[PDB]
Amino acid sequence: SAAPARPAHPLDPLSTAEIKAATNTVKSYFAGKKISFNTVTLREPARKAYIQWKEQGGPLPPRLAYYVILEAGKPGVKEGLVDLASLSVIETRALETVQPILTVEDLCSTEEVIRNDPAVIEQCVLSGIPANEMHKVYCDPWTIGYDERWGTGKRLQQALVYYRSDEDDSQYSHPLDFCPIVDTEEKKVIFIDIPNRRRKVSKHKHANFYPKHMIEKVGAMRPEAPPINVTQPEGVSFKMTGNVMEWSNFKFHIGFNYREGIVLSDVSYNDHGNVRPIFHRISLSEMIVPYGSPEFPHQRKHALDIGEYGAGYMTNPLSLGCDCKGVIHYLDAHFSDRAGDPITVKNAVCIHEEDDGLLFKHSDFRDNFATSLVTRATKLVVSQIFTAANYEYCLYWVFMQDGAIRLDIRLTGILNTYILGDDEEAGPWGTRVYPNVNAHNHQHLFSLRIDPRIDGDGNSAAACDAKSSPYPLGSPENMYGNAFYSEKTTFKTVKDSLTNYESATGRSWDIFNPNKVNPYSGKPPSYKLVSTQCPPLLAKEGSLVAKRAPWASHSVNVVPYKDNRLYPSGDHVPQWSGDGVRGMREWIGDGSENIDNTDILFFHTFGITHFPAPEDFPLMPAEPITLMLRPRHFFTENPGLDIQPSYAMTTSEAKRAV
């Protein structure tokens, strides 16, 4: 658009018209050059500018698009900003020594390259696939991640190769032994990693999971179960105005981008007319999935899924009534493809409300529980599912009627697999999940990025450790040895914040406003992070994994806010060695900057360590991960008590029923 209609809300994602305006603007600025588009996305307003606009009648922030382009024959990328109202490029630079995120188009192009490459064909034949069956060879073409033979000097993928006997097979039972290295932009194989011990393609049957396969494998499918139907005959209780949600006193903006997927902003709670801010922004900002086999070339498997592929780019169009059950409001996602044209993923986000059991209950034993009050809970769910080659990550942002917010994740999909010889032991680094199939050990780690405003600006964070009293059993201070308390360590400088979950203290963390006080308890209003799926990073200090994901070696990292501190392994993740002051390493600095009562960013590392078993193959049952942020000392009483009970009978009423 010329200029584009500006959005309803400054945090709305770029419309398809805005995306096209941005790419036309960039094409014109680079006229006479052959360029392609890697990223065209909203450059969100500065936090100050946004808050000022929202709450102080301030300036309208300009509507800006951030782009990343490649140019034929030039190394690295160029990036910059387009001002949409004037259709001009206002910032631009060349970054010749980085590589960018891999788009779906980029994942889709590698198969034709390797199928037609003579050296790859030769390895296929050595592996036992005839030269004329190349259409049966497939690959998951990961970023090379990091290989010290090339650095960032070419843009590279590593084709993890597999074989299908029929196109409807699940290929993951038949990995091949070798790994071609592909120059993404030149479209050619530059190298093939070949193991010292060769293992030829498995001769077993594929391990398949569609109904036609299972009928052959186990005799029959189970009959259809009788349905469980879920209806909202009088509609839903939430209200959307564009991307702005209001539900059970919560209000917030639902955003979305190519990289983070869902981005929740401007989150507040309406406390009987007093609208109290909670978070300025919350999202997942990066991931790392480090594998645990030391043998070459498997050190290159440590995918930073968000930075290297994108939870937006990889997001699934969710299916009419299957992925999301019940009455659903959907949002579409819009990106640019390599030619500069907008592409849409329909039904990328689903939004709906679901039963969530009991909110609270109490009954009196005195009349045999006749005196009783029970109130049911409803939750609001904002969700997407993304597919990073083999993996499926189901992400659910959950708002609850006690004022808590939960992130739930379910891992499913398929294990990454490598070939195993008939006599080869997989342990200790993997598991034989099927004949000739080694599924290597790995971790899934996530970096949750919280930009808080607990009851307003000026916040701090703290570790909370349960501790026995230091006074011994038998002392006047602790006669019976039962005394215990919560030790709160307020983080003063960045260094103080660098903390891990500790089972020995049941560690939680507070994000609080030290400028306010709860009139009952005397404590600051807070949201408490309750999170126990917090694995140590197993890779060693100084390892490639530890270097490329500096955020992952602590459960909690707290840094001063600054604009554009979104991505903790840096802006351009693929093929960075992990050497340099960028991302979280930059933001931590020398550890000395103040983080007490200021504008802060709280980054939480959480996830699981996965030791594969046969139950996970050929397709894996959902594995749950959760964390919760809970109001503590935020309210002066339970915020849900004005919700009509499902059943309520008082002591006097019970006497009147006789």
Added chain:
Amino acid sequence: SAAPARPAHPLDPLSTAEIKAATNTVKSYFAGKKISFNTVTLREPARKAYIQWKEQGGPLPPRLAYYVILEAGKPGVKEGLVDLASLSVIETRALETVQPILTVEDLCSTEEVIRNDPAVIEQCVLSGIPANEMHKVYCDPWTIGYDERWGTGKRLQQALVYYRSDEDDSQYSHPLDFCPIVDTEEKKVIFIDIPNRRRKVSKHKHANFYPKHMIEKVGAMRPEAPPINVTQPEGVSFKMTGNVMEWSNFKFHIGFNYREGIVLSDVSYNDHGNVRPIFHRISLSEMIVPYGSPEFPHQRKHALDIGEYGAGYMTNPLSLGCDCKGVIHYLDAHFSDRAGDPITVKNAVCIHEEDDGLLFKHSDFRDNFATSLVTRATKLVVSQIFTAANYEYCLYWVFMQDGAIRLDIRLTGILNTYILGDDEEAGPWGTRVYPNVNAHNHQHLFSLRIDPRIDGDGNSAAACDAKSSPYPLGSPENMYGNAFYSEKTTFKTVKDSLTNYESATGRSWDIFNPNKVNPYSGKPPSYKLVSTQCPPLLAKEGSLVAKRAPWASHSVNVVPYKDNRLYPSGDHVPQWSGDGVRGMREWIGDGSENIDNTDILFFHTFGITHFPAPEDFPLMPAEPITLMLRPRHFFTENPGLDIQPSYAMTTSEAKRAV
């Protein structure tokens, strides 16, 4: 009675006729004595006798009732066994130095005692309540728990006293400062603990939570939300035959008793015709809720809710339609009252199946996720809710279609509160949640009791710790420093098993059959305990809490099986000092007995540490606790793949749809 009709199944709880036959048998044996009934319950068959009967065409185990009685003018209790087929006492003994669980009748009787006691009246008056308002004074009459002034020589309750301005008030905003001590059997106050600092009754309004109260307090209730309706128009997929459940290949017996509440037995999975045992029995066997204020008499707050009141005794009659939503199968519970007559709690257990989101999913990026399979999960839920004076514990046993079993607990109800002076500081041992109300710190700890038979008899247990390779970064064995593995420590003797959850290793525990092997992975079939809500016991070694709950000081305790090893703080819990070799302390012994490849009992300590906040008051929002037991190396592939997908499109089908 009598001889009563035998049950459908040896593990069925005693019917009302069996309870009556038992009490008539005992009344007759003790003819001419004045006795009352504390417990009349099934004495479950020995494990060997049961398995032999079930699987080896063995002897029918005799139908037995375990009883506990008091006799007027005699200290402690008598207990024994009645053989129901012959209406006779076959075992009997006098235990003069123990006290037994408190029943609902026992709770209910105390208020009349303290309201009419001249010394209590006097303290109420000194506290600001006129002598003629005693009908407004209430108490939660806990067991004394343990007080070294009386031991077990009298049966004693401590009346935690509160004031209500109107019968419909929630009394917990108005605790009084003193604690009467009552002889349960003599029905008299024998002492009153009076604090050095007196604190008169609060003059504030009660902190109330029924709708008529909230309308006064916040102006109005929220309007009724539009409904979410759940129906199963073609019925449910599970099938009950008496107490025996079959659902999604699982089969098990649903039992129930006065103490543990729900007991799940004889749990097996049907693996395409091969019916494989998993557990012989699983239940919650004890609890402890230790409070963290060292000031006298608050050391006496550390309720062992299961052993001292009972999760069956205290269980709520459920909804119908409110506590449990949807299509429900209910079981009733039956007990004996003090006169020997059966009592019934209707709808004590609810059984139903609910949607549980996605079971699994995978799509191929190659055709933009057109090639896709999605299967929804159903869970089966077996639940109860019990109320122990102020607390509500909602217990959900959940069976899942990937073969996992979960226990989910939600804590709600009301904080236990003590009085706080106008100028008194509650911290560090509690929180001021309302004016003049101190809610003390406490933990809620639970002992899950698992009697396993993973794929048959002969089991072991182990800790599994994730560990970096011992070889350093840069070595030939760990060049890039990423290698990691699961270290499995098999417990050989009892002492080896005494282990805590460790965040540093993401500790899980395996219960496995070392006599079998998975044909793919080479590992033993196992169920893995995945449990991270595992607080350390904060009370010190040698404390009254640590002594009375020996199980609580480790996350995991594994001991040899023997008959009647149910209750880890002993058979008769109230007023035990914690000195002596009984319960878990007895079963552990000197630590040296074998627990490798034998019949074992695996006791798991889990729960939360609760630092109250005003969000919890006057009624508390549900707080979740969970643990899971997952099949690992049990199956040779994902067990749910024969369940019909909600959506499935193969690659060939996608291409044919154009």
